Amino acid sequence: ASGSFNYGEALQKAIMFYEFQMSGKLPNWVRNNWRGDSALKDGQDNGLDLTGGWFDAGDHVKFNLPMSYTGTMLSWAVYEYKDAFVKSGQLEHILNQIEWVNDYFVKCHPSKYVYYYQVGDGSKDHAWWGPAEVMQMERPSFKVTQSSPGSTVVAETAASLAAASIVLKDRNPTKAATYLQHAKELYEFAEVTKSDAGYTAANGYYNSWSGFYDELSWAAVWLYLATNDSTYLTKAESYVQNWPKISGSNTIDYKWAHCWDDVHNGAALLLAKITGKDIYKQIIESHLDYWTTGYNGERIKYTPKGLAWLDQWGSLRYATTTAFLAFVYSDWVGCPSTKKEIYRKFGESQIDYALGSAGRSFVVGFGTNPPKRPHHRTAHSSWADSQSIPSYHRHTLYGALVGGPGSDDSYTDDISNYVNNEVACDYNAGFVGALAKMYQLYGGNPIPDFKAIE
């Protein structure tokens, strides 16, 4: 313990958050005693068991694009920082969550070119305010096929399964082999179709804004790492030419973040490590330089108290993800010496901001004056279809990273504020990797055997 915060406790809780998002029939390894079985008929409108996975955010839709992004990110965290997970006693918990979500993706893949990408209707799900276990509305399931395709979600799902096949191989080699086979199939599905025309049920929520070429590289990278089949490296490298551009230009867009929609920056980082090529160093360093000291004379906005601030919706999600990339690249022997220090320092600053360096934690159930009214149906647990009843949440959503402050560091803590005070799978994903690095560096002991029991 050498750092400003208890990073082990923070890591432990940030992993635990995913328990609270669990959908379906809860297995005996679940630690908490306040979530119960939910959404048990998921899939039955299409003759399948599609139970499992995670509810996305403060809602109960299963949106497989951010869900699969999260899956990949959690495996990437283990792939980079396994020894931090082992030392903190957190490996078994993150592997449990990685197995959980990827088991749901396997369920969603019932024929080679049939992939279910959503369970729940956004409008019906969001119109009701109550806990998961007592939902009564219809929860339709949605699929892409060869004639009605979804390359972006399929490819991101391939990535998740390929990454899981690596990190779960020691514990469950049989399941790992199953994941890899589904990953390879889903990748072929994404490649043969090259289209999102059938990916419609997430519209207004998780549209594919950047297109699927970033996912085609990212999934091929993971599949190369899982297989050592050089064809996947060829494809990953190839698809770089179609990565998202600054509009009107031929320059890859470095001014956003690695996120559920756009995974090119993480793909670049891993391609720099795999191949050593300058092309990829140039990509990832433009991005990381823009976030830190500047690139070609422009830098991201910073709040007065030191948050790198991309957007008002999920600012902490973006900063904390970029923190994880900064750590992974600065840990690499190929990073320029000086940028190592700049990038690590940046990552520290952003995690410490999340954890409370500005005077207040943004992590539910952690630190000083954390959020107490996150925009989350199940944590709140209304019996009256009302955000105001009860006045206080009946359950603590330990570990949940909220959306974050305004550009002036301000924040309130309102149940109704889904911009600054929602919580989500993708918000915690890169955060968990970054917290593992901080624990590696600075320690802080997890609460021993901590379980969220009421």
Catalytically active residues, by annotation:
413, 422
Site string for Ca ion, 153-192 (x = CB under 5 A): ----------------------------------------
Type of residue numbered 417: N
Pull the structure tokens for residue 140: 């339709």
User: CB of 155: closest distance to Ca ion in angstroms?
Assistant: 8
Residue with tokens 């019932």: 110
Q: Which is nearer to Ca ion, 144 or 351 (CB)?
A: 144
Cβ-in-10-Å burial (0-12, 13-18, 19+) of 203 comes to: exposed
Rule CB under 5 A: say whether 214 interacts with Ca ion: yes
Rounded Cα distance between 356 and 176, Å, is 38
Q: Between 193 and 330, name the residue whose CB sits nearer to Ca ion.
A: 193
What token pair was written down for 163? 């990454």
Q: Which two tokens stand for residue 27?
A: 């297995």
How far is Cα of residue 120 from the mean position of the Cα atoms in its chain? 20
Q: Is residue 386 within 8 Å of 130, Cβ to Cβ?
A: no
Are the C-beta atoms of residues 22 and 133 closer than 8 Å to each other?
A: no
Q: Is position 211 annotated in a ligand binding site?
A: yes
Is residue 425 within 8 A of residue 72, CB to CB? The reply is no
420 belongs to the binding site for Ca ion (CB under 5 A): no
Longest dimension (CA), the chain: 58
- Stretch touching Ca ion by CB under 5 A, among 48-56, 141-149, 209-217, 246-254: 209-217
Nearer CB in complex with Ca ion: 217/420: 217
Give the binding range for Ca ion (CB under 5 A) out of 114-122, 206-214, 271-279, 365-373.
Answer: 206-214
State the nearest-atom distance from the C-beta of 370 to Ca ion, in Å: 32
Q: Is 416 exposed, middle or buried (0-12, 13-18, 19+ CB in 10 A)?
A: exposed
Structure tokens at 44: 């039955």
* Stretch near Ca ion under the rule CB under 5 A, chosen from 87-95, 158-166, 202-210, 271-279: 202-210
| Bridge partner list, 114 | 111, 145
Q: CB 191 → Ca ion: shortest distance, Å?
A: 15
Q: Is 322 in the site for Ca ion (CB under 5 A)?
A: no
The residue (of 210 and 330) whose beta carbon lies closer to Ca ion is 210
Contact with Ca ion (CB under 5 A) among 210, 321, 378, 396: 210
The one segment of 82-90, 92-100, 191-199, 207-215 that binds Ca ion by CB under 5 A: 207-215
Nearer to Ca ion, 23 or 210 (CB): 210
Specify whether the backbone of 82 is left (phi greater than 0), alpha (psi in -120 to 50) or beta.
Answer: alpha
The answer to the question of whether 408 is labelled as a binding residue is no
Upper half-sphere CA count for residue 262 (Cβ side, 13 Å): 18
| C-beta closer to Ca ion: residue 214 or 289 | 214
Interactions with Ca ion, residue window 276-305 (CB under 5 A): none
Of 19-27, 118-126, 203-211, 311-319: span binding Ca ion (CB under 5 A): 203-211
Taking the complex as a whole, the smallest distance from the CB of residue 151 to Ca ion amounts, in Å, to 9
- Report the C-alpha gap between 400 and 418 in whole angstroms: 14
| 8 Å CB contact between 217 and 240 | yes
Question: Tokens 């973006």 label which residue?
Answer: 318
Size of the site for Ca ion (CB under 5 A): 2
**Nearest approach, Cβ of residue 186 and Ca ion (Å):** 15
* Residues annotated in a binding site for Ca(2+): 210-211, 214-215, 261
Residues forming contacts to Ca ion in the complex (CB under 5 A) are 210, 214
* Residues annotated in a binding site: 210-211, 214-215, 261
